Amino acid sequence: NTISVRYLYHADHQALTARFFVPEGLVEFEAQPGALLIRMETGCDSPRHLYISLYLLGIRASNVSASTRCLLESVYTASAARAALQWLDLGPHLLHRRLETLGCVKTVSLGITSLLTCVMRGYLYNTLKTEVFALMIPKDMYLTWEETRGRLQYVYLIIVYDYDGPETRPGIYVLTSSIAHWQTLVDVARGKFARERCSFVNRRITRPRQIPLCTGVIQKLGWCLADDIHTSFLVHKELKLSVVRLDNFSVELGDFREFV
Protein backbone atom coordinates (compact mmCIF):
# COMPACT_ATOMS: atom_id res chain seq x y z
CA ASN A 1 0.00 0.00 0.00
CA THR A 2 1.64 3.19 1.27
CA ILE A 3 5.31 3.86 0.47
CA SER A 4 5.29 1.36 -2.41
CA VAL A 5 8.93 1.91 -3.34
CA ARG A 6 8.81 -1.11 -5.67
CA TYR A 7 6.51 0.80 -8.03
CA LEU A 8 8.87 3.78 -8.20
CA TYR A 9 11.94 2.24 -9.85
CA HIS A 10 11.54 0.59 -13.23
CA ALA A 11 14.78 -1.42 -13.40
CA ASP A 12 18.23 -1.50 -11.82
CA HIS A 13 21.47 -1.50 -13.84
CA GLN A 14 24.41 -3.44 -12.43
CA ALA A 15 26.43 -2.43 -15.50
CA LEU A 16 28.92 0.43 -15.07
CA THR A 17 28.28 2.49 -18.20
CA ALA A 18 30.49 5.33 -19.43
CA ARG A 19 29.89 7.86 -22.22
CA PHE A 20 32.81 8.29 -24.65
CA PHE A 21 32.65 10.68 -27.59
CA VAL A 22 34.14 9.14 -30.74
CA PRO A 23 35.30 10.61 -34.08
CA GLU A 24 33.00 10.03 -37.05
CA GLY A 25 35.74 8.24 -38.99
CA LEU A 26 35.78 5.35 -36.51
CA VAL A 27 32.01 4.94 -36.01
CA GLU A 28 31.78 2.49 -38.93
CA PHE A 29 31.32 -1.13 -37.81
CA GLU A 30 31.69 0.30 -34.30
CA ALA A 31 27.99 1.23 -34.54
CA GLN A 32 27.27 -2.41 -33.70
CA PRO A 33 27.23 -2.65 -29.87
CA GLY A 34 29.49 -5.70 -29.68
CA ALA A 35 32.99 -4.25 -29.99
CA LEU A 36 35.89 -3.52 -27.64
CA LEU A 37 36.99 0.04 -26.91
CA ILE A 38 40.75 0.45 -26.52
CA ARG A 39 42.38 3.77 -25.64
CA MET A 40 45.68 4.41 -27.44
CA GLU A 41 48.58 6.32 -25.86
CA THR A 42 49.50 8.70 -28.66
CA GLY A 43 52.79 10.48 -28.07
CA CYS A 44 51.43 13.74 -29.47
CA ASP A 45 49.96 16.20 -26.98
CA SER A 46 46.85 16.74 -29.14
CA PRO A 47 45.42 14.26 -28.41
CA ARG A 48 47.43 12.05 -26.04
CA HIS A 49 44.60 9.48 -26.01
CA LEU A 50 42.67 8.04 -28.96
CA TYR A 51 40.01 5.33 -28.75
CA ILE A 52 40.17 2.56 -31.36
CA SER A 53 37.99 -0.43 -32.20
CA LEU A 54 39.42 -3.93 -31.95
CA TYR A 55 38.77 -4.31 -35.69
CA LEU A 56 41.16 -1.41 -36.28
CA LEU A 57 43.95 -3.56 -34.81
CA GLY A 58 43.41 -6.18 -37.54
CA ILE A 59 44.63 -4.05 -40.44
CA ARG A 60 48.16 -4.52 -39.06
CA ALA A 61 47.73 -7.94 -37.38
CA SER A 62 49.72 -10.77 -38.94
CA ASN A 63 47.61 -13.81 -38.04
CA VAL A 64 44.39 -12.38 -39.52
CA SER A 65 43.68 -13.57 -43.06
CA ALA A 66 45.11 -11.32 -45.76
CA SER A 67 41.80 -11.44 -47.66
CA THR A 68 40.13 -9.92 -44.60
CA ARG A 69 42.93 -7.33 -44.50
CA CYS A 70 42.11 -6.38 -48.09
CA LEU A 71 38.57 -5.64 -46.89
CA LEU A 72 39.65 -3.71 -43.78
CA GLU A 73 42.07 -1.67 -45.90
CA SER A 74 39.08 -0.22 -47.78
CA VAL A 75 37.11 0.46 -44.58
CA TYR A 76 39.00 2.79 -42.25
CA THR A 77 40.49 5.19 -44.85
CA ALA A 78 39.60 8.28 -42.82
CA SER A 79 41.01 10.57 -40.13
CA ALA A 80 41.28 7.68 -37.65
CA ALA A 81 43.29 4.82 -39.14
CA ARG A 82 45.52 7.12 -41.21
CA ALA A 83 46.73 8.47 -37.88
CA ALA A 84 46.60 5.07 -36.18
CA LEU A 85 49.09 3.57 -38.62
CA GLN A 86 51.10 6.78 -38.14
CA TRP A 87 51.33 6.09 -34.39
CA LEU A 88 50.70 2.56 -33.08
CA ASP A 89 52.53 1.02 -36.05
CA LEU A 90 55.54 3.18 -35.13
CA GLY A 91 55.63 1.59 -31.66
CA PRO A 92 58.53 -0.82 -31.22
CA HIS A 93 56.87 -4.09 -30.12
CA LEU A 94 54.89 -2.13 -27.51
CA LEU A 95 51.10 -2.39 -27.41
CA HIS A 96 50.02 -3.44 -23.90
CA ARG A 97 51.34 -0.10 -22.65
CA ARG A 98 49.94 1.83 -25.63
CA LEU A 99 46.56 0.06 -25.44
CA GLU A 100 43.93 -0.01 -22.70
CA THR A 101 40.74 -2.08 -22.88
CA LEU A 102 37.54 -0.20 -21.92
CA GLY A 103 34.71 -2.73 -22.26
CA CYS A 104 32.13 -2.80 -25.03
CA VAL A 105 29.43 -0.51 -26.40
CA LYS A 106 25.87 -0.42 -25.12
CA THR A 107 24.52 2.18 -27.59
CA VAL A 108 25.94 4.38 -30.37
CA SER A 109 24.57 7.82 -31.23
CA LEU A 110 25.11 9.11 -34.76
CA GLY A 111 26.02 12.63 -35.89
CA ILE A 112 29.33 14.21 -36.81
CA THR A 113 30.57 13.32 -33.29
CA SER A 114 29.39 9.81 -32.40
CA LEU A 115 29.12 9.64 -28.63
CA LEU A 116 28.55 6.09 -27.42
CA THR A 117 27.79 4.41 -24.12
CA CYS A 118 30.10 1.54 -23.16
CA VAL A 119 29.87 -0.70 -20.10
CA MET A 120 33.09 -1.28 -18.16
CA ARG A 121 31.58 -4.07 -16.02
CA GLY A 122 28.58 -6.38 -16.08
CA TYR A 123 26.24 -7.36 -18.87
CA LEU A 124 25.79 -5.06 -21.86
CA TYR A 125 22.19 -4.83 -23.03
CA ASN A 126 19.55 -2.60 -24.57
CA THR A 127 17.61 -0.33 -22.22
CA LEU A 128 14.53 -1.65 -20.40
CA LYS A 129 16.13 -5.13 -20.48
CA THR A 130 14.64 -5.75 -23.94
CA GLU A 131 17.15 -6.80 -26.60
CA VAL A 132 20.34 -8.47 -25.36
CA PHE A 133 23.28 -7.13 -27.35
CA ALA A 134 26.13 -9.56 -27.99
CA LEU A 135 29.90 -9.21 -28.31
CA MET A 136 31.43 -9.65 -31.78
CA ILE A 137 34.95 -11.10 -32.06
CA PRO A 138 36.49 -10.87 -35.55
CA LYS A 139 36.22 -14.21 -37.33
CA ASP A 140 39.83 -15.35 -37.77
CA MET A 141 41.01 -13.79 -34.49
CA TYR A 142 38.96 -16.23 -32.37
CA LEU A 143 40.47 -19.57 -31.34
CA THR A 144 40.46 -22.15 -28.55
CA TRP A 145 43.41 -24.21 -27.34
CA GLU A 146 40.91 -26.96 -26.46
CA GLU A 147 38.51 -27.86 -29.26
CA THR A 148 36.13 -29.38 -26.69
CA ARG A 149 33.62 -26.88 -25.35
CA GLY A 150 33.94 -26.18 -21.64
CA ARG A 151 31.24 -25.81 -19.01
CA LEU A 152 32.21 -22.12 -18.65
CA GLN A 153 34.98 -20.37 -20.58
CA TYR A 154 36.65 -17.09 -19.67
CA VAL A 155 37.91 -15.01 -22.60
CA TYR A 156 41.42 -13.54 -22.88
CA LEU A 157 43.16 -11.19 -25.34
CA ILE A 158 46.77 -12.31 -25.85
CA ILE A 159 49.04 -10.05 -27.92
CA VAL A 160 51.85 -12.11 -29.47
CA TYR A 161 55.09 -10.32 -30.44
CA ASP A 162 57.10 -11.99 -33.21
CA TYR A 163 60.80 -11.17 -33.54
CA ASP A 164 61.58 -12.87 -36.87
CA GLY A 165 61.68 -10.03 -39.39
CA PRO A 166 63.22 -6.62 -38.73
CA GLU A 167 59.73 -5.06 -38.71
CA THR A 168 57.62 -6.71 -36.02
CA ARG A 169 54.04 -7.58 -37.01
CA PRO A 170 52.37 -8.58 -33.73
CA GLY A 171 49.44 -10.96 -33.70
CA ILE A 172 46.19 -10.63 -31.77
CA TYR A 173 44.42 -13.60 -30.15
CA VAL A 174 40.98 -13.48 -28.62
CA LEU A 175 40.36 -16.89 -27.09
CA THR A 176 37.89 -18.56 -24.74
CA SER A 177 38.91 -21.32 -22.33
CA SER A 178 37.58 -22.94 -19.17
CA ILE A 179 40.99 -22.37 -17.58
CA ALA A 180 40.91 -19.93 -14.67
CA HIS A 181 44.44 -20.28 -13.21
CA TRP A 182 47.08 -17.96 -14.67
CA GLN A 183 49.89 -20.20 -13.40
CA THR A 184 48.65 -23.01 -15.67
CA LEU A 185 47.57 -20.73 -18.52
CA VAL A 186 51.17 -19.57 -18.92
CA ASP A 187 52.23 -23.23 -18.85
CA VAL A 188 49.91 -24.19 -21.72
CA ALA A 189 51.25 -21.07 -23.45
CA ARG A 190 54.82 -22.37 -23.02
CA GLY A 191 54.73 -25.27 -25.47
CA LYS A 192 52.27 -23.79 -27.96
CA PHE A 193 54.25 -20.64 -28.82
CA ALA A 194 57.55 -22.47 -29.25
CA ARG A 195 58.36 -20.31 -32.28
CA GLU A 196 57.59 -17.21 -30.19
CA ARG A 197 59.54 -18.36 -27.14
CA CYS A 198 62.33 -19.15 -29.60
CA SER A 199 61.85 -15.65 -31.06
CA PHE A 200 62.49 -14.00 -27.69
CA VAL A 201 65.87 -15.72 -27.70
CA ASN A 202 66.09 -15.01 -31.43
CA ARG A 203 66.49 -11.28 -30.93
CA ARG A 204 69.34 -11.69 -28.44
CA ILE A 205 71.18 -13.86 -30.97
CA THR A 206 71.20 -10.95 -33.47
CA ARG A 207 70.46 -7.53 -31.92
CA PRO A 208 71.57 -6.81 -28.34
CA ARG A 209 70.27 -3.28 -28.95
CA GLN A 210 66.58 -2.69 -28.15
CA ILE A 211 65.24 -4.92 -25.37
CA PRO A 212 63.00 -7.85 -26.32
CA LEU A 213 59.85 -8.08 -24.22
CA CYS A 214 56.69 -10.18 -23.96
CA THR A 215 55.76 -13.19 -26.03
CA GLY A 216 52.22 -12.27 -24.96
CA VAL A 217 50.01 -10.56 -22.40
CA ILE A 218 46.98 -12.04 -20.62
CA GLN A 219 44.12 -10.24 -18.88
CA LYS A 220 40.62 -11.24 -17.82
CA LEU A 221 37.70 -9.92 -19.88
CA GLY A 222 34.67 -11.99 -18.88
CA TRP A 223 32.97 -15.36 -18.77
CA CYS A 224 30.63 -17.05 -21.23
CA LEU A 225 28.81 -20.38 -21.55
CA ALA A 226 29.66 -22.80 -24.34
CA ASP A 227 26.06 -22.49 -25.54
CA ASP A 228 26.58 -18.72 -25.58
CA ILE A 229 29.43 -19.21 -28.07
CA HIS A 230 28.39 -18.49 -31.66
CA THR A 231 29.95 -17.90 -35.07
CA SER A 232 27.45 -15.86 -37.08
CA PHE A 233 27.47 -13.06 -39.64
CA LEU A 234 27.57 -9.26 -39.67
CA VAL A 235 26.99 -6.42 -42.14
CA HIS A 236 27.96 -2.75 -42.09
CA LYS A 237 28.56 -0.39 -45.03
CA GLU A 238 27.66 -3.32 -47.34
CA LEU A 239 31.08 -4.88 -46.69
CA LYS A 240 29.80 -8.18 -45.28
CA LEU A 241 31.92 -10.14 -42.80
CA SER A 242 31.21 -13.15 -40.59
CA VAL A 243 32.07 -12.79 -36.90
CA VAL A 244 32.37 -14.95 -33.78
CA ARG A 245 29.44 -13.83 -31.63
CA LEU A 246 29.17 -14.22 -27.84
CA ASP A 247 25.69 -13.92 -26.34
CA ASN A 248 25.27 -13.24 -22.61
CA PHE A 249 28.81 -11.99 -22.01
CA SER A 250 29.37 -10.35 -18.64
CA VAL A 251 32.26 -7.85 -18.65
CA GLU A 252 35.08 -8.17 -16.08
CA LEU A 253 38.11 -6.13 -17.17
CA GLY A 254 41.19 -7.45 -15.41
CA ASP A 255 44.56 -5.72 -15.64
CA PHE A 256 47.13 -6.74 -18.24
CA ARG A 257 49.75 -9.30 -17.15
CA GLU A 258 53.03 -9.08 -19.04
CA PHE A 259 55.12 -12.25 -19.34
CA VAL A 260 57.56 -14.03 -21.62
Binding site: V188, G191, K192
Partner: protein, 49 residues
Protein backbone atom coordinates in the same frame (compact mmCIF):
# COMPACT_ATOMS: atom_id res chain seq x y z
CA UNK B 1 67.68 -48.81 -33.20
CA UNK B 2 64.62 -47.19 -31.64
CA UNK B 3 64.04 -45.24 -34.86
CA UNK B 4 64.21 -48.53 -36.77
CA UNK B 5 61.56 -49.90 -34.41
CA UNK B 6 59.22 -46.93 -34.86
CA UNK B 7 59.75 -47.20 -38.62
CA UNK B 8 59.19 -50.96 -38.89
CA UNK B 9 56.15 -50.66 -36.62
CA UNK B 10 54.93 -47.76 -38.76
CA UNK B 11 54.03 -45.72 -35.66
CA UNK B 12 56.21 -42.61 -35.91
CA UNK B 13 56.24 -40.16 -33.02
CA UNK B 14 54.29 -36.91 -33.60
CA UNK B 15 57.34 -34.89 -32.49
CA UNK B 16 56.82 -36.39 -29.00
CA UNK B 17 53.55 -34.39 -28.98
CA UNK B 18 53.29 -31.03 -27.23
CA UNK B 19 54.87 -30.91 -23.78
CA UNK B 20 51.53 -29.79 -22.36
CA UNK B 21 49.88 -32.69 -24.21
CA UNK B 22 52.25 -34.93 -22.26
CA UNK B 23 51.25 -33.01 -19.12
CA UNK B 24 47.60 -33.89 -19.73
CA UNK B 25 48.46 -37.59 -20.12
CA UNK B 26 48.79 -38.02 -16.35
CA UNK B 27 45.14 -36.95 -16.03
CA UNK B 28 44.34 -39.13 -19.06
CA UNK B 29 43.77 -37.85 -22.59
CA UNK B 30 43.18 -39.20 -26.08
CA UNK B 31 46.25 -40.05 -28.16
CA UNK B 32 44.75 -41.65 -31.26
CA UNK B 33 43.64 -39.40 -34.08
CA UNK B 34 40.11 -40.24 -35.16
CA UNK B 35 39.99 -42.42 -38.25
CA UNK B 36 38.39 -40.91 -41.35
CA UNK B 37 35.82 -43.29 -42.83
CA UNK B 38 34.66 -45.82 -40.23
CA UNK B 39 31.74 -47.79 -41.67
CA UNK B 40 32.59 -50.72 -39.38
CA UNK B 41 32.43 -48.84 -36.04
CA UNK B 42 34.63 -49.05 -32.95
CA UNK B 43 37.64 -51.37 -33.09
CA UNK B 44 39.31 -53.26 -30.24
CA UNK B 45 41.94 -55.96 -29.70
CA UNK B 46 44.45 -57.28 -27.18
CA UNK B 47 47.56 -59.45 -27.13
CA UNK B 48 49.04 -62.10 -24.81
CA UNK B 49 52.00 -64.48 -24.97
Amino acid sequence: VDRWIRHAAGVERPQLLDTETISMLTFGSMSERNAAATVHGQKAACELI
